[PDB]
A = this chain, B = another copy of it.
Amino acid sequence: EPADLNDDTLRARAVAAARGDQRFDVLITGGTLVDVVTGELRPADIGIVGALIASVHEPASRRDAAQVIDAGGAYVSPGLIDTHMHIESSMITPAAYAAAVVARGVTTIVWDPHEFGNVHGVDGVRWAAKAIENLPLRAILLAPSCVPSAPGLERGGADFDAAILADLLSWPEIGGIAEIMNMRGVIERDPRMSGIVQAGLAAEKLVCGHARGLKNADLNAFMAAGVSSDHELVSGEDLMAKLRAGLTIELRGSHDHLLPEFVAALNTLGHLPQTVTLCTDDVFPDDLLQGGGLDDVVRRLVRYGLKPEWALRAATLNAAQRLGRSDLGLIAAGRRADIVVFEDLNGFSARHVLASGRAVAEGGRMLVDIPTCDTTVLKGSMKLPLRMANDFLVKSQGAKVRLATIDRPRFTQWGETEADVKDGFVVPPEGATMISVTHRHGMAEPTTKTGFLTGWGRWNGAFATTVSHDSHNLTVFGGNAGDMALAANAVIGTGGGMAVASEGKVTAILPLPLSGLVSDAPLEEVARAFEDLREAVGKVVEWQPPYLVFKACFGATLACNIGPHQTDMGIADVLTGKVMESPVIEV
């Protein structure tokens, strides 16, 4: 690709059909074309020969095709393109991800496999490549750039230097470097991050960014280095600033409450900037099943008042432009027939989906087989023995200690509190929730490291997860050691996943036997298990939106973020490079 489009026999045939001398393979008839260049909705029929669109012409003027697809009463769009996403967050395999989003009209994704990368390293990125190769969904890979996210502060399953990055950039499956979240290293010209960027520039592929909270001087410096896109948009003003700065915007639907501000900001401008694309970022399996993938970013934007023509152009032509793929994103003679027929421009229900000229879905149902990929290398990734309640408690000598605390959910700061000591162990003080992290990849000693969170409500029980961005070590939150050991051991035994315990019983398990990140069960089952897990965790603790929510359970160990975080090494501070081994300050 796109040399498959350029075959002489296929071109002669596409041209002869366009001419009216040969029939199409496929005619899409009676539809209204979403013309993503002019923004018009206009009747046209579509003539397709093999993987090419051969003609865009007057309704009902041709009737000669091997196959006719009825778009009467409906709308014809280029298939949708997601510019930034992670299959792993949906908790299923790439084949199951494909069956879900292709039936919804998604024909191209840009997949940063950094979760698999942190677990299995380069073999992770290889599995991802293998797994996409014969899907009806095109998947362009990005090379994970920050593994682990904070070198020297945490240990995942892998470590990627400038050389590993250059080697991944050499792969034809890899379309650039995946979101660079070590912003300081780029801006301050740290050797490792700078070597990675330089590799990205030397390969002449995309260098994708994570620019959360970057403003003014810092952003100019992030872009001067070569970082050229961002999805970490925190507000309508942030969007405008980032547009003005000249970044390609990867507009995500994963923070839904921000979509109305994005819409108001763009409507105030009066035109959709050609640098705006859409992406899903990280979609949970229940939201994937019920809402959708990239199609739901289109649907939600429109729901919030963005013209369906702007939503679609962002999801098609602008994204193809970003990707340098002038075969994609546009229903035009000479382009690839990745096409979706939508019942209307509010529900975006896909009546038909073609990928490279072949009908692959109808009415929400796959019409073709999706090849699976052997998952063996992903199994057996929990490499630690079962935990003891005492794994969760902190040893100390005296009878009263000063304790460092990790203060506030999400916007973390150093705290301090007091605690009694009994039986050689510290006594979980009032207002504190334990966070315990254990290296589970076998690259380090499996020693449970426990910290004391503050501002996380009162936990009556525990939650264990093997999804824990980005090191994905075994991570347990709890109100008492006993329930933390039940939850931990349940996910160890299933080979990874999530579990809730309360009052000496395990109340919910979601098995994620692949890498501790995903499951091979069908989406419907993973979705339902996830809702039940959310139900069960809800009985353990009262959420206080926003910030003190369930999702915060997967981000507490993300060591590259500002402020203290508990990791599998201790409490980490990226600003100093200091890992605190024990939380006991004194006594």
Contact = CB atoms under 8 A, between A and B. Distances in A.
Contacts of A290: none
Contact of A15 (B37, B52, B225, B245): B225
A55 interface: yes
Within the oligomer, what is the number of copies of this chain? 2
A220 interface: yes
B224 A42 contact: no
Interface string A59-85: 000000000000000000000000000
Contacts of A332: 223, 245-247
A56 B15 contact: no
A535 interface: no
Contacts of A35: 244
Given A37-B275, A246-B335, A324-B324, A6 B202 contact: yes
A373 interface: no
Interface string A215-253: 011111101111110000000000010011111000000
Nearest to A55: B220
A198 interface: yes
Interface stretch (A16-24, A347-355, A388-396, A512-520): A16-24
A126 interface: no
Interface of A (DSSP majority class): mixed
Contact of A40 (B54, B244, B333): B244
Contact of A6 (B11, B40, B201): B201
Nearest to A218: B19
A14 interface: yes
Contact of A217 (B5, B20, B198, B217): B20
Contacts of A223: 18, 332-334
Interface string A326-365: 1000111111000000000000000000000000000000
Interface residues of A, number: 74
Nearest to A53: B224
Given A11-B198, A19-B221, A226-B334, A37 B274 contact: yes
Contact of A244 (B20, B37, B53, B189): B37
A376 interface: no
Contact of A11 (B38, B201, B321): B201
Q: Which of A225, A269, A330, A335 has the most CB of B within 10 A?
A: A225
Given A53-B224, A58-B216, 4 more contacts: A8-B198, A35-B244, A39-B269, A40-B244
10 contacts: A11-B198, A15-B224, A18-B221, A37-B273, A38-B269, A54-B224, A57-B220, A223-B334, A245-B332, A321-B321
**5 tightest Cβ-Cβ pairs between the two chains A and B:** A246-B332, A18-B221, A6-B201, A223-B333, A18-B220
